Design a binder for this molecule. Structure first.
Ligand code: AKG
Ligand code: AKG
Ligand code: FE2
Ligand code: FE2
Lengths: 335, 335
């Protein structure tokens, strides 16, 4: 992760190790570079993570905080997630019909910002934890729309153009509480993670560690999430979690982390670090080349495995038979 | 800026986008309200811009044009500014002694109105551009003095009384040519911008965008002006110009724009819109409250920075050392 950076103005260290959680695997630091540095462009083009420290991407939002937001964001509805533990168990509603025994571990709920601020206030007066996650569309107040327009769209748009990425699928505003943890998972789109308030420790695993992270079945509501409990790894069920090695960093106000598509990421708001605020940017990856180019990269093999699982689930007319058939194919033949 | 307003009498649109220049930043419309509307009074009291459409402030001047003026204004002298480009580079004479390498980019020149009208005529027979700017004192013809007396002094005086503003520092008559551009800058006084003939696009930036507009050093002849070339922004020298968001409008005959003190403003006479005529009104802001009131507003912090720069320039007995000392104070200590 690297030594805690010293804040300007002789203010103490931004954070200290005691705020970071302990895990069973090793890690090395993700590079912190300047957007002008040729090495940063090199990392992004090769689809490797990099923390850009001077993009000014969300510059107008650095002043944001709960008071400012509540007052100017408006009186619309915001999706607030809640959990009893620190780990926020998110899931896919549409895939619940496939796994009837799946009991929910986290509940969402629309509410007004001022309500979230209040509901958050008394919880600080507690084991419960909330996590607000909502898109930054025009639906919001005029002032917030001005700040939004003030983002460095010149930088990010140029970045989108040279990488060949597709459309910006969405912008997500995230406000969480200290200690909050979003378990490891991967997304299929390219992502620029812009930190605004507070610090978050981000642990990333490359796509080739698929075999050590044991993702749920594609048809399961937790598709794309790791089945391993990072706080208590079951080595009998997931032996290869003992070989996992990750890339880590702690991002703070002004930092932008590039999370390449298909890369795993574990995110946590530093303990006793106050609330955190982040805005993420999603872009569809560049279209896959017409003619295949070998040797296939790891993320491409992951795409293929996802496709096989999907096709099989439809061909058998039932996602619950996917596993049995796969075992039938493999046992005594390929294993 | 808003859709071009349709002129009365089924005359086409007042103007069309093709007449507006293209810039790298986003903008939203300044409210166009009636002076009777409570929202307008609310905007002015909170020191936010607003275009009042029915003040009748300069009603008698709406008939004005070059012929009428030349004939009745008199045979006195008028300060005419000239430039080779469209951007009029104005400067402070008194501060030239501090920056000897500063070469002038625009020249002033007293001349008689009929001469200005003539000099303007052949230029339309060209890259040169002129801009007449002179005060409306009794020095002028009897007829122009009658029109002047006919301004709605009842409205503006009442406005001056309720806002607590100081004396009317001056009245400026402005006559320019289509395409003319006055680069972004801020004034320290409150201003009512009364449009009389033609249309002008006005782009304003609030005081809190100080960090994105990079004003010249206080001792520089271009003090209060932005160092950024809006037509070709140097993002390496002024990275934060990528985060600038402005408030825009196009004022025409009869409109009065309130430009709050310390607010930045970029003004341009619509392309192929003919000459433009404007009269501005300057008032010293209301005296700063005896006991400070936190949290300080942005314009107050700008006042403080200007004061520090001024004091430092005198304390070191030389304005050229201000920068070196500021860097010495900051480097490795606050940055
Ligand atoms: O910040 C977080 O807690 C989660 C971020 C995340 O999963 C994402 O941006 O995809
Ligand atoms: O109309 C213009 O070109 C400039 C107006 C201006 O700068 C002012 O009224 O202070
Ligand atoms: Fe994610
Ligand atoms: Fe001005």
């Amino acid at each position: 992760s690297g030594e805690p950076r010293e804040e300007a103005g002789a203010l103490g260290p931004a954070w200290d190790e005691s705020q970071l959680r302990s895990y069973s695997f090793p890690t090395r630091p993700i590079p912190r570079l300047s957007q002008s540095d040729p090495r940063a462009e090199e990392l992004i083009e090769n689809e490797e993570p990099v923390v850009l420290t001077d993009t000014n991407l969300v510059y107008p939002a650095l002043k944001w905080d709960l008071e400012y937001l509540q007052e100017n964001i408006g009186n619309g509805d915001f999706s607030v997630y809640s959990a009893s533990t620190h780990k926020f168990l998110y899931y896919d509603e549409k895939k619940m019909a496939n796994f009837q025994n799946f009991k929910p571990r986290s509940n969402r709920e629309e509410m007004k910002f001022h309500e979230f601020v209040e509901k958050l206030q008394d919880i600080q007066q507690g084991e419960e934890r909330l996590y607000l996650q909502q898109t930054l569309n025009d639906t919001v107040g005029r002032k917030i729309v001005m700040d939004f327009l003030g983002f460095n769209w010149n930088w990010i748009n140029k970045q989108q153009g040279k990488r060949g990425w597709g459309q910006l699928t969405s912008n997500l505003l995230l406000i969480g509480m200290e200690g909050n943890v979003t378990p490891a998972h991967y997304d299929e789109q390219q992502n620029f993670f812009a930190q605004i308030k507070g610090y978050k420790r981000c642990i990333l695993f490359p796509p080739d560690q698929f075999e050590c992270l044991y993702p749920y079945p594609v048809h399961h509501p937790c598709d794309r999430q790791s089945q391993v409990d990072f706080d208590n790894p079951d080595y009998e069920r997931f032996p290869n979690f003992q070989n996992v090695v990750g890339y880590e960093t702690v991002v703070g106000p002004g930092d932008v982390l590039y999370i390449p598509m298909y890369w795993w990421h574990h995110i946590e708001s530093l303990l006793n670090g106050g609330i955190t605020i982040t805005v993420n940017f999603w872009y569809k990856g560049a279209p896959t080349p017409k003619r295949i180019e070998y040797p296939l990269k790891a993320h491409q093999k992951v795409a293929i495995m996802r496709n096989i699982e999907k096709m099989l689930g439809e061909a058998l007319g039932n996602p619950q038979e996917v596993g049995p058939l796969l075992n039938t194919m493999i046992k005594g033949r390929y294993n």
